[PDB]
């Protein structure tokens, strides 16, 4: 049980890291597209 | 009277418990239970960690 809960904690941390990376990339692209669209 | 006396002690052992293996159990499951099978598909036959 202890090994299992450690494993799920690691998996959850990994999923949060992946989601944070995707969100950061998307938000950066969105802001930069905002600046570009404002230019035109 | 001249030969050195030899006393013998006998022990017999078996496979360890999951609890007493410690964090090694988790550190081997991270390496086999998810990494190898999912990201390589080697389809091997391997014994238990214990």
From TrEMBL, chain B:
Q: Where in the cell is it found?
A: Cell inner membrane; Cell membrane
Indicate the family of this protein.
Answer: Belongs to the WzzB/Cld/Rol family.
Function as written in the Swiss-Prot or TrEMBL entry: Modulates the polysaccharide chain length of enterobacterial common antigen (ECA).
Q: How does it assemble?
A: Probably part of a complex composed of WzxE, WzyE and WzzE.
Q: What is this protein called?
A: ECA polysaccharide chain length modulation protein
Its lineage opens with: Bacteria, Pseudomonadati, Pseudomonadota, Gammaproteobacteria, Enterobacterales
Q: Which residues of the full protein are shown?
A: 49 to 98 of 348
């Amino acid at each position: 049980w202890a090994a299992r809960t450690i494993f799920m904690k690691s998996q959850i941390k990994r999923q949060e890291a992946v989601a944070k990376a995707i969100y950061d990339r998307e938000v950066r692209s969105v802001e930069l597209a905002l600046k570009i669209a404002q230019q035109q | 009277y001249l030969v050195k006396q030899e006393w013998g002690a006998t022990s017999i052992t078996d496979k360890p418990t999951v609890n007493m293996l410690g964090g090694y159990y988790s550190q081997q499951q991270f390496l086999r239970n998810l990494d190898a099978r999912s990201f390589s598909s080697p389809q091997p036959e391997q014994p238990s960690i214990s």
